[PDB]
Amino acid sequence: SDKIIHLTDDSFDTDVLKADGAILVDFWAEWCGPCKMIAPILDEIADEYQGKLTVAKLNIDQNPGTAPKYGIRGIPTLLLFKNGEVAATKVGALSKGQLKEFLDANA
Ligand SMILES: [Cu+2]
Protein backbone atom coordinates (compact mmCIF):
# COMPACT_ATOMS: atom_id res chain seq x y z
CA SER A 1 0.00 0.00 0.00
CA ASP A 2 3.16 2.11 -0.13
CA LYS A 3 2.79 3.54 -3.68
CA ILE A 4 -0.84 4.71 -3.48
CA ILE A 5 -1.29 8.48 -3.23
CA HIS A 6 -3.43 9.67 -0.33
CA LEU A 7 -5.62 12.46 -1.68
CA THR A 8 -7.50 15.22 0.12
CA ASP A 9 -9.97 17.82 -1.10
CA ASP A 10 -7.22 20.43 -0.87
CA SER A 11 -4.59 18.42 -2.76
CA PHE A 12 -6.92 17.03 -5.45
CA ASP A 13 -6.39 19.91 -7.89
CA THR A 14 -2.60 19.70 -7.68
CA ASP A 15 -2.28 15.90 -7.48
CA VAL A 16 -4.84 14.98 -10.15
CA LEU A 17 -6.09 17.90 -12.24
CA LYS A 18 -2.67 19.52 -12.76
CA ALA A 19 -0.89 16.20 -13.35
CA ASP A 20 0.02 15.05 -16.86
CA GLY A 21 0.19 11.26 -16.54
CA ALA A 22 -2.66 8.83 -16.03
CA ILE A 23 -4.17 8.61 -12.54
CA LEU A 24 -6.73 6.09 -11.26
CA VAL A 25 -8.66 7.62 -8.36
CA ASP A 26 -10.56 5.40 -5.92
CA PHE A 27 -13.40 7.16 -4.08
CA TRP A 28 -14.00 5.09 -0.97
CA ALA A 29 -15.06 5.00 2.67
CA GLU A 30 -14.35 2.70 5.62
CA TRP A 31 -18.00 1.68 6.00
CA CYS A 32 -18.12 0.48 2.36
CA GLY A 33 -17.65 -3.28 2.10
CA PRO A 34 -16.97 -3.39 -1.64
CA CYS A 35 -14.41 -0.59 -1.23
CA LYS A 36 -12.43 -2.77 1.18
CA MET A 37 -12.75 -5.72 -1.22
CA ILE A 38 -10.97 -3.86 -4.04
CA ALA A 39 -8.29 -2.28 -1.83
CA PRO A 40 -5.82 -5.19 -2.26
CA ILE A 41 -6.58 -5.24 -6.00
CA LEU A 42 -5.60 -1.56 -6.22
CA ASP A 43 -2.33 -2.34 -4.43
CA GLU A 44 -1.50 -4.94 -7.08
CA ILE A 45 -2.36 -2.53 -9.90
CA ALA A 46 -0.16 0.16 -8.35
CA ASP A 47 2.74 -2.32 -8.29
CA GLU A 48 2.03 -3.81 -11.72
CA TYR A 49 1.51 -0.48 -13.52
CA GLN A 50 4.37 1.35 -11.78
CA GLY A 51 5.73 4.10 -14.03
CA LYS A 52 2.66 4.00 -16.31
CA LEU A 53 -0.20 4.67 -13.88
CA THR A 54 -0.54 6.35 -10.50
CA VAL A 55 -3.18 4.93 -8.13
CA ALA A 56 -4.74 7.33 -5.63
CA LYS A 57 -7.48 7.17 -3.00
CA LEU A 58 -9.92 9.84 -1.82
CA ASN A 59 -11.89 9.05 1.35
CA ILE A 60 -15.29 10.69 0.91
CA ASP A 61 -16.03 10.77 4.65
CA GLN A 62 -12.83 12.76 5.26
CA ASN A 63 -13.07 14.73 1.98
CA PRO A 64 -16.75 15.48 1.30
CA GLY A 65 -16.14 18.12 -1.38
CA THR A 66 -14.62 16.31 -4.36
CA ALA A 67 -17.05 13.49 -5.19
CA PRO A 68 -20.02 15.80 -6.00
CA LYS A 69 -17.89 17.67 -8.55
CA TYR A 70 -17.82 14.46 -10.63
CA GLY A 71 -21.46 13.47 -10.11
CA ILE A 72 -20.39 10.48 -8.02
CA ARG A 73 -23.52 8.87 -6.59
CA GLY A 74 -22.05 5.78 -4.93
CA ILE A 75 -18.87 4.02 -3.92
CA PRO A 76 -16.61 2.47 -4.79
CA THR A 77 -16.18 4.57 -7.92
CA LEU A 78 -12.98 4.49 -9.94
CA LEU A 79 -12.17 7.58 -12.00
CA LEU A 80 -9.39 7.32 -14.58
CA PHE A 81 -7.82 10.71 -15.30
CA LYS A 82 -5.56 11.66 -18.19
CA ASN A 83 -4.13 15.18 -18.50
CA GLY A 84 -6.48 16.36 -15.74
CA GLU A 85 -9.64 15.14 -17.51
CA VAL A 86 -11.83 12.11 -16.83
CA ALA A 87 -11.15 9.44 -19.45
CA ALA A 88 -13.33 6.70 -17.92
CA THR A 89 -15.23 5.74 -14.78
CA LYS A 90 -16.31 2.51 -13.13
CA VAL A 91 -18.97 2.26 -10.41
CA GLY A 92 -18.92 -0.71 -8.05
CA ALA A 93 -16.44 -3.42 -7.15
CA LEU A 94 -14.68 -5.55 -9.77
CA SER A 95 -12.04 -8.26 -10.01
CA LYS A 96 -8.38 -7.73 -10.84
CA GLY A 97 -8.95 -9.19 -14.30
CA GLN A 98 -11.87 -6.83 -14.85
CA LEU A 99 -9.82 -3.84 -13.68
CA LYS A 100 -7.03 -4.80 -16.09
CA GLU A 101 -9.61 -4.94 -18.89
CA PHE A 102 -10.96 -1.55 -17.80
CA LEU A 103 -7.47 -0.04 -18.01
CA ASP A 104 -6.58 -1.68 -21.33
CA ALA A 105 -9.87 -0.36 -22.75
CA ASN A 106 -8.42 3.12 -22.14
CA ALA A 107 -4.90 2.44 -23.47
CU1 LIG B 1 -7.18 9.90 4.74
Author numbering: 1 to 107
Give sentences copied directly from the paper behind this entry:
Thioredoxins (TRX) are small globular proteins of about 100–110 residues, which are conserved in all living organisms. Two TRX forms were described in Escherichia coli, Trx1 and Trx22. The former, called EcTRX throughout this work, is a widely used experimental model for investigating the molecular basis of protein stability, folding and function.
Regarding cavities of the L107A mutant, the outcome of this substitution is a slight increase in the solvent-exposed surface, as Leu107 is a partially exposed residue. The four EcTRX mutants were crystallized in the oxidized form, and numerous protein-metal interactions were observed as a result of the Cu(II)-salt added for crystallization, as it was previously observed for the wild-type variant.
